[PDB]
Amino acid sequence: DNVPAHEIVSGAPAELSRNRVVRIYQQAKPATQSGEYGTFAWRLDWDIVDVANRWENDLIGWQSSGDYMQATQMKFTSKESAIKFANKQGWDFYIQEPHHRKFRVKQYANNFVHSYGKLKHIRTK
Amino acid sequence: KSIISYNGNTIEIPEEYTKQAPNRDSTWAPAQASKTEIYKNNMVRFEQKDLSKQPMPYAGIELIAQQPVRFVHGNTAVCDGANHNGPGAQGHPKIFINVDAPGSHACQYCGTRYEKE
Amino acid sequence: TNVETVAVAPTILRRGGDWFASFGRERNSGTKLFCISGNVNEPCTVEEEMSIPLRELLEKHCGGIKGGWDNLLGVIPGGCSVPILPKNICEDVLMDFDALKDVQSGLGTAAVIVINKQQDVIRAIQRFAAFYKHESCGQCTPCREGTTWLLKAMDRFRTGQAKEREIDMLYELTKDIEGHTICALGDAAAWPIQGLIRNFRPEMETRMKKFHDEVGAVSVGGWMKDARVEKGKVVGAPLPGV
Amino acid sequence: AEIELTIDGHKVSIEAGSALIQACEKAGVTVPRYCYHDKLAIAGNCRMCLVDVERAPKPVASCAYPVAPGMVVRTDTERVKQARENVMEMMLQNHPLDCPVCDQGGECDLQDQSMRYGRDRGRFTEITGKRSTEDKNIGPLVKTSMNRCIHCTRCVRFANDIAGAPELGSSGRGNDMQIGTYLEKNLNTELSGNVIDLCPVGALTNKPYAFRARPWELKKTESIDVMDAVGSNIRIDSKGVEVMRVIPRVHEDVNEEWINDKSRFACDGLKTQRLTTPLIRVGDKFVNATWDDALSTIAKAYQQKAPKGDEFKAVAGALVEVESMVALKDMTNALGSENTTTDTPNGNSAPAHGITFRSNYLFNSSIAGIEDADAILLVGTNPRREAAVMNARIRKAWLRQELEIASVGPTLDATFDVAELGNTHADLEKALSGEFGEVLKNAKNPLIIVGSGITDREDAGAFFNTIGKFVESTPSVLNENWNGYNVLQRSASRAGAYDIGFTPSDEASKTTPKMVWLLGADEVAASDIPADAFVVYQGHNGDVGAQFADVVLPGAAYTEKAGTYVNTEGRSQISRAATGPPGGAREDWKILRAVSEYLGVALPYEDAYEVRDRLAEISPSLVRYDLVEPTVFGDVAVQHSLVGPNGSVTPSSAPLTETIENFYMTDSISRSSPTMAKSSIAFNKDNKKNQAF
Numbered sequence A: 001d002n003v004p005a006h007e008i009v010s011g012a013p014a015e016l017s018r019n020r021v022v023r024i025y026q027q028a029k030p031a032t033q034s035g036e037y038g039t040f041a042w043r044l045d046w047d048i049v050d051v052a053n054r055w056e057n058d059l060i061g062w063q064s065s066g067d068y069m070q071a072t073q074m075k076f077t078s079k080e081s082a083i084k085f086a087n088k089q090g091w092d093f094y095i096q097e098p099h100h101r102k103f104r105v106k107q108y109a110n111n112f113v114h115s116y117g118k119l120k121h122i123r124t125k
Numbered sequence B: 001k002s003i004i005s006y007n008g009n010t011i012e013i014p015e016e017y018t019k020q021a022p023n024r025d026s027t028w029a030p031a032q033a034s035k036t037e038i039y040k041n042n043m044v045r046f047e048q049k050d051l052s053k054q055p056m057p058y059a060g061i062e063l064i065a066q067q068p069v070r071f072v073h074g075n076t077a078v079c080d081g082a083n084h085n086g087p088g089a090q091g092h093p094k095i096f097i098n099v100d101a102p103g104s105h106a107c108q109y110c111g112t113r114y115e116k117e
Numbered sequence C: 001t002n003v004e005t006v007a008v009a010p011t012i013l014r015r016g017g018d019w020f021a022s023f024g025r026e027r028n029s030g031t032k033l034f035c036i037s038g039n040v041n042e043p044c045t046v047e048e049e050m051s052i053p054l055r056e057l058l059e060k061h062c063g064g065i066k067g068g069w070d071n072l073l074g075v076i077p078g079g080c081s082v083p084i085l086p087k088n089i090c091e092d093v094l095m096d097f098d099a100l101k102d103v104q105s106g107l108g109t110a111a112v113i114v115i116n117k118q119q120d121v122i123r124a125i126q127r128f129a130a131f132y133k134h135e136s137c138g139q140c141t142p143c144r145e146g147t148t149w150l151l152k153a154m155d156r157f158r159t160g161q162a163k164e165r166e167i168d169m170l171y172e173l174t175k176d177i178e179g180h181t182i183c184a185l186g187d188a189a190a191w192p193i194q195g196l197i198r199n200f201r202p203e204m205e206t207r208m209k210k211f212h213d214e215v216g217a218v219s220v221g222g223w224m225k226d227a228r229v230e231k232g233k234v235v236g237a238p239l240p241g242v
Numbered sequence D: 001a002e003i004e005l006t007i008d009g010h011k012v013s014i015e016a017g018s019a020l021i022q023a024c025e026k027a028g029v030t031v032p033r034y035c036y037h038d039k040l041a042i043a044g045n046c047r048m049c050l051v052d053v054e055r056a057p058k059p060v061a062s063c064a065y066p067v068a069p070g071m072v073v074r075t076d077t078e079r080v081k082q083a084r085e086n087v088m089e090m091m092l093q094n095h096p097l098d099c100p101v102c103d104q105g106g107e108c109d110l111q112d113q114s115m116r117y118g119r120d121r122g123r124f125t126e127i128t129g130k131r132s133t134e135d136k137n138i139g140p141l142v143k144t145s146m147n148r149c150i151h152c153t154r155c156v157r158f159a160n161d162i163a164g165a166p167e168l169g170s171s172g173r174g175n176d177m178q179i180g181t182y183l184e185k186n187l188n189t190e191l192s193g194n195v196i197d198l199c200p201v202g203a204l205t206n207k208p209y210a211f212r213a214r215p216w217e218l219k220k221t222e223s224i225d226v227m228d229a230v231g232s233n234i235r236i237d238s239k240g241v242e243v244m245r246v247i248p249r250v251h252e253d254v255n256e257e258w259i260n261d262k263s264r265f266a267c268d269g270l271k272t273q274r275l276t277t278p279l280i281r282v283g284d285k286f287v288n289a290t291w292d293d294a295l296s297t298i299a300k301a302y303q304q305k306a307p308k309g310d311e312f313k314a315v316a317g318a319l320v321e322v323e324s325m326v327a328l329k330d331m332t333n334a335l336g337s338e339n340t341t342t343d344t345p346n347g348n349s350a351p352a353h354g355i356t357f358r359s360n361y362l363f364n365s366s367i368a369g370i371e372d373a374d375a376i377l378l379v380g381t382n383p384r385r386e387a388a389v390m391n392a393r394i395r396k397a398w399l400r401q402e403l404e405i406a407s408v409g410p411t412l413d414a415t416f417d418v419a420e421l422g423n424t425h426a427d428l429e430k431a432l433s434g435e436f437g438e439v440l441k442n443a444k445n446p447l448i449i450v451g452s453g454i455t456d457r458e459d460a461g462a463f464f465n466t467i468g469k470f471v472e473s474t475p476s477v478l479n480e481n482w483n484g485y486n487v488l489q490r491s492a493s494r495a496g497a498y499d500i501g502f503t504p505s506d507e508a509s510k511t512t513p514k515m516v517w518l519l520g521a522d523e524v525a526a527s528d529i530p531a532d533a534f535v536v537y538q539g540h541n542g543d544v545g546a547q548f549a550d551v552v553l554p555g556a557a558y559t560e561k562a563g564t565y566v567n568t569e570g571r572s573q574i575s576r577a578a579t580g581p582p583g584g585a586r587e588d589w590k591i592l593r594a595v596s597e598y599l600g601v602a603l604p605y606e607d608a609y610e611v612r613d614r615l616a617e618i619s620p621s622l623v624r625y626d627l628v629e630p631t632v633f634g635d636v637a638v639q640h641s642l643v644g645p646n647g648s649v650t651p652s653s654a655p656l657t658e659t660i661e662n663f664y665m666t667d668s669i670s671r672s673s674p675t676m677a678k679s680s681i682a683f684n685k686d687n688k689k690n691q692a693f
């Protein structure tokens, strides 16, 4: 199922496959934009490490880091491919299943439906 | 003048070099570190160093605050901060400022203040 | 429904449909009100068979064009929303929907406006553009942002402060609005300008020569050599429609 | 039923009556737009979405053109492209040249679609220049630069329809049409922060976040909000060591695409008043100290105090995660104590609704269940404050179908019409035996909403008894296809606490503790702590709880650790750490594990996977994430917990009061935020900026 340690032929540090957890997901539809072009690929990136994520240099005020994977992120065409890759490397992962908008029928004419009782609210346009 | 350090010892700094700028005493942004704090945190690298040689440029906030308000007839003031003497485009992108509200309204790029009269 | 189409209905029902069809040509049948205004000798309001000729309608009801048929520049058949007609083609044109649609106009509300040779056509069309700018409800972006562009261009054409390619630019600006608005106010805004360009571009060219020789050389959008921005305003250039 | 049509040659099948743009979206065809949005009414004023359909002579608005059988749609005709260019040309004519200074820049739809569909250059160089627009003050949360408004009316549509705040609207006509209030009035609603996301251009912008970063330099992390108990899904944008902003991400079964203003703007409380080093009280002052020194001081206080059994009390606050609660409870048990209390009033005693079955303290109808409601009775609860997004959900349900809402409890300002049946338990008896009880009996999908504030009353037994009797009687309220009994928690941690049995024993409530351990626990008073008690505080912000302590330990905040939170639905959700804890702060369950080792009761797990294993041992539904499964014990639970043991309780004559006095400041984070402080004083009821008349 999962490649153990020390028969990975990549040469990466053992710590990568021992005490690091990656996460696989699809990017969420950004709330700020209506475009959806970034949401189809399956990203893979590493969960952060507490001590080594980022600190502030005491000279010019920069963001120092000891985590060599903080900037790395792979793109895959499909969830199964990402799973296969992570398994072949021996990475512990978690899958975050995507959420989608539930379909509902929208009619422009619905803005002008006659109301037989009291108006619940004044639509304004 | 006298800033106490984390050690509990005293650091002496001339008054002129505690001012944030030559023309302004205090910070002009919440995140901006004051000179007092700068020395308190970097005093090791400031030893045997001559403060009068350090850059100390003028604080532009007051310089723009000294510029008089331009009065305009209509509802919209147009500003582009161009240099009428040299060639090319040397200003900032041309924007239009609404002046119907009471008071002066500042150009978003250059800070020049306009008012409807 | 319009008021007069409802108004004619009881008389139509009483007198019968065939009698009403007898007046006016096929598909253009009945008698409409014809408000007549502008540079005619006696402005009037009358009712008349549909498909009457212009010349006859004018000379019989409104004492003719002020100065005679020679002194006619053009006529706007229907209200301001309809492209203006030229002198040569309006002699033989018929007052049904069909003929006016054939000469690329429409009956609209049959509100004929006549303009004599003394009057300036560009001033009239600019005023129509100002009317549409004032009248847009501002809901849909094409109309909302296009009527103001058309006004800004028409002022400069009224003074001549433009280059001659900006005429074709303006035509395309009209086409930006025509088919894309929520309601037909945008169509109405686009049309008078297109009629003006189609029929009186030489007049615009003469007035642009008047601006160039008379005042100065103009770049696109009305800028000139020493037109600059100073202390909040534009100085160095007329700026039409301040 | 589902009808068929072709879009750009493809074959797409869609429900009849849907808009053409829904069909295009389903068929994988991209259509530009501005004014259209999935959660808002259809407007059709931007004219960006035009397409050609063979029947129509002129291009048609895709967001508002209903689909019909056999329709043929082309989104790629030369006429369509020319149309998009024309529309964009007109859109940008009066748009200000503000991109270097606009906060939207880099994530602006006007930019992206101008670049994708507009022309490379512009034709508008008018010496008269562009139009300009006054700026409008609508409160301390949403900064306005109205020159950039493109008049999409998303803000108006949302403020009117979704949040029920009608002060926003459009004044004037034509070119001078301005979005605003026509006079100085705040956009006063707890959902106001969402017009920031809805406004496609930079006209409406986050004010506390203004000018602090650009979208391309932000690290985006998907995590879980903990301000309320709804469990909204959020995206945390951070650069380096500090968190910049919080924006919603879609989860159609929890918050839809919205979050309330507290969840959005209390992020600024995470970079001030923080706890960074252990503190030890010496005299009347705290002194900084090392982790070893702190923990050894705790051990020495434990050996000196010598607590027996329930003399070691543990209190859990509104914000803590499940793993930390589990650690704390296990350690306290291994000390021989059962005094694992919650922080709420009367939290020294066990809750009146019981703990045995989950459906006794959860939103048994899912949050999505509100969509089906035909009648709702609110008992001692104000959802507008306790769960804002759920209030919006109830509002949407009420707008689009007929629905009867009545409430018992304080007179509440609601976004929907409610019937007030009284402020008292007697009024509840009258109602449940009266006309609204009949309405519930007849209803097809009824649901009874009980606030968590009632559980905190001494007479909670009487309310739970009355409600349980009514439920056990009426089959519509509780059958095998629909559970209408619902408890609405307000704190993100109450559901998880009850799930693991973080409940005091009967004999524990009698004892007077000699040592108190506050985990969060910032609702504590002077009274609940004995003077002689040795108090340990563990948290992330400095608040009253840390003021009460003898030793303070810094713990990570919800943005700095990957924890489990259980919302009102009983849904278990996992968060992700955006940044690392500041200073010398630590992960909470690690803190508990280490202190337990110093106490000689060393916990059996020292690794996150072992923590998840212990969680699976406590309950199997903590490890199943994003899953809701109904209870098979619906009928048993009501009888065994609500009507059974609550017979003896005597109802008081005290009227029901509001659970939370101030919506904006309810937590340590929220009380540490300058923005919430400013918002609270800006959005006060007695301020004319928030009145209307």
Ligand code: SF4
Binding pocket: C135, C136, C137, C138, C139, C140, C141, C143, C144, C181, C182, C183, C184, C185, C186
């Ligand atoms: S085209 Fe019609 S709806 Fe659109 S802005 Fe003009 S008048 Fe208003």
Ligand code: SF4
Binding pocket: D095, D096, D097, D098, D099, D100, D102, D103, D104, D105, D106, D108, D109, D110, D111, D148, D200, D201, D202, D203
């Ligand atoms: S709203 Fe968009 S297009 Fe307008 S200035 Fe800001 S970033 Fe640029």
Ligand code: SF4
Binding pocket: D148, D149, D150, D151, D152, D153, D154, D155, D156, D179, D198, D199, D200, D201, D203, D204
């Ligand atoms: S402020 Fe934003 S959302 Fe409101 S009308 Fe203007 S562009 Fe649309």
Ligand code: FES
Binding pocket: D032, D033, D034, D035, D036, D043, D044, D045, D046, D047, D048, D049, D050, D061, D062, D063, D064
């Ligand atoms: S998105 Fe369809 S017209 Fe605006």
Ligand SMILES: [Zn+2]
Binding pocket: B079, B080, B081, B092, B107, B108, B109, B110, B111, B112
């Ligand atoms: Zn400027």
